Amino acid sequence: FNDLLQQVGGVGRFQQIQVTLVVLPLLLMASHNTLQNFTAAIPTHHCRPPALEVWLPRDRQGQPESCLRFTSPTEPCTDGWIYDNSTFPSTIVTEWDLVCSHRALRQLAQSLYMVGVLLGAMVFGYLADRLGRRKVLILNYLQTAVSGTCAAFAPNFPIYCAFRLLSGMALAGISLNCMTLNVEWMPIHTRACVGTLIGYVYSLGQFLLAGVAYAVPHWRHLQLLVSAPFFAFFIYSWFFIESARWHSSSGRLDLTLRALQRVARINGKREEGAKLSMEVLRASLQKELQASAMELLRCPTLRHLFLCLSMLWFATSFAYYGLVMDLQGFGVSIYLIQVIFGAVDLPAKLVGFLVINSLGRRPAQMAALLLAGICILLNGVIPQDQSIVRTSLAVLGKGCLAASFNCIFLYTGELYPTMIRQTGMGMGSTMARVGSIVSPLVSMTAELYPSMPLFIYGAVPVAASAVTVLLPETLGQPLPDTVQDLESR
Numbered sequence: 030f031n032d033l034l035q036q037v038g039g040v041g042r043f044q045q046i047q048v049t050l051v052v053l054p055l056l057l058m059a060s061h062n063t064l065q066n067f068t069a070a071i072p073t074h075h076c077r078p079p080a081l082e083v084w085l086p087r088d089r090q091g092q093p094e095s096c097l098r099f100t101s102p103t104e105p106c107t108d109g110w111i112y113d114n115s116t117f118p119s120t121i122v123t124e125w126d127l128v129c130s131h132r133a134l135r136q137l138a139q140s141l142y143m144v145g146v147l148l149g150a151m152v153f154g155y156l157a158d159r160l161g162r163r164k165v166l167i168l169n170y171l172q173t174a175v176s177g178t179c180a181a182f183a184p185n186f187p188i189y190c191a192f193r194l195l196s197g198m199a200l201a202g203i204s205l206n207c208m209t210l211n212v213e214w215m216p217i218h219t220r221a222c223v224g225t226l227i228g229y230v231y232s233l234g235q236f237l238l239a240g241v242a243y244a245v246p247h248w249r250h251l252q253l254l255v256s257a258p259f260f261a262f263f264i265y266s267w268f269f270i271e272s273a274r275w276h277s278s279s280g281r282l283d284l285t286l287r288a289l290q291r292v293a294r295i296n297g298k299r300e301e302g303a304k305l306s307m308e309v310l311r312a313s314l315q316k317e318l319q320a321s322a323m324e325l326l327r328c329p330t331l332r333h334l335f336l337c338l339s340m341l342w343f344a345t346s347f348a349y350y351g352l353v354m355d356l357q358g359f360g361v362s363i364y365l366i367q368v369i370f371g372a373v374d375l376p377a378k379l380v381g382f383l384v385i386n387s388l389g390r391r392p393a394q395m396a397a398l399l400l401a402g403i404c405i406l407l408n409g410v411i412p413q414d415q416s417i418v419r420t421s422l423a424v425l426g427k428g429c430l431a432a433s434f435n436c437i438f439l440y441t442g443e444l445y446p447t448m449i450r451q452t453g454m455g456m457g458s459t460m461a462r463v464g465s466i467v468s469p470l471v472s473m474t475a476e477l478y479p480s481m482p483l484f485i486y487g488a489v490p491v492a493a494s495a496v497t498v499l500l501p502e503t504l505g506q507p508l509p510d511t512v513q514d515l516e517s518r
């Protein structure tokens with residue numbers, strides 16, 4: 030097939046336009062995943078006195094305690110709280126009083142959000158195989174736009190949580206289908222590079238969230254501004270071209286020929302396409318015309334690899350989403366810390382790339398995960414008074430975790446046999462999403478100990494780094510094709 034696609038311009042007009050317009054939506058992906066840092070921030074709040082020096086007990090720091098009002102000039106504060114308006118004019122926390130006793134709800138919502146992402150990874154994955162990549166992409170654009178706009182207009186917390194879960198489902202569908210439709214339309218010799226570009230467009234997305242949230246501090250307007258471009262995306266995405274590989278797989282080669290002829294003229298190489306007919310299409314497409322995930326558990330050689338890669342994905346995503354969404358405690362302005370976090374990835378990916386090529390694949394994962402864990406533990410131990418040390422160490426941890434996300438992507442792409450390679454791509458990635466469902470929840474345990482969430486957030490990556498030992502080195506080795514090749518290693 031690559032033959033034909035190449036025969037049809039290879040990369041060119043239809044390819045540059047579609048690639049740019051399918052990767053453009055991912056610029057807002059990172060803004061949606063990490064939105065609750067700016068739309069759900071906690072301003073310093075104090076108890077509203079009966080309708081402050083007399084009416085507010087003071088804590089060690091001298092500041093007014095947040096959740097206690099003197100019974101007489103203590104008692105649970107039931108008259109509401111005067112949230113500070115200095116920064117964050119309004120965040121869900123302020124709007125729906127998600128503080129004090131219910132403070133945990135602030136995390137719960139995000140958990141629910143990524144729950145949708147996990148669901149959006151599965152259901153809208155299966156739909157992608159039944160209705161076509163383009164139709165599912167169109168529905169994802171429409172669902173993201175509508176759900177985000179409605180969540181910006183939620184009248185109470187449960188509706189906001191449900192609509193954010195729908196937003197997560199639709200955005201996970203977007204993330205999967207953009208990559209799939211982009212890979213399936215490009216030649217293999219430029220497929221891997223596309224993935225790299227994907228990551229970069231995700232990374233730059235963080236910068237966007239740093240900027241927009243500065244200009245639009247209100248949470249409702251920020252949510253609407255972030256989720257409204259998806260309406261224009263749904264408006265312009267009716268013009269996409271269905272992936273011809275899916276059309277061939279479903280058995281409708283007529284639509285494959287139609288799409289190939291359409292890309293032909295688009296690319297200007299019509300005479301070639303026009304020559305491409307049903308007989309030639311069948312002749313060059315007969316040979317191409319994945320095993321079950323149960324095989325991953327059943328085969329012990331595959332079971333060991335699945336367990337190791339699941340632990341790596343889970344730990345990496347868990348620590349990453351633990352660090353990305355703790356921005357206020359570093360002591361610097363959260364917009365600046367967001368800009369810095371976005372800027373870590375560009376050199377972090379280069380360092381990971383260089384290490385992966387030079388030293389190896391397994392040592393790169395080991396070093397990245399162990400460094401992330403040690404940075405995390407030392408951030409947990411170093412007192413808050415040292416601001417530059419905590420900021421630098423958290424930044425280094427985030428960079429190491431981004432390098433891990435890539436290293437584990439490449440590692441799990443080259444480790445699995447070709448029969449189960451794509452399914453292993455899914456479940457491993459699925460484990461990552463499962464990690465991001467557990468990451469906020471464990472955060473809730475803070476009320477127990479201020480530093481416990483960081484302690485677990487670093488204990489898990491160290492365990493993953495230790496687990497990495499069992500994995501086999503893949504540098505200089507061809508990709509495997511069967512279980513026997515794995516056993517030979």
Ligand SMILES: Nc1ccc(C(=O)NCC(=O)O)cc1
Nearest residue numbers: 146201204228231434461462
């Ligand atoms: N280069 C990156 C790609 C994806 C992610 C991520 O957050 N993935 C979770 C999911 O989208 O299910 C992070 C960095």
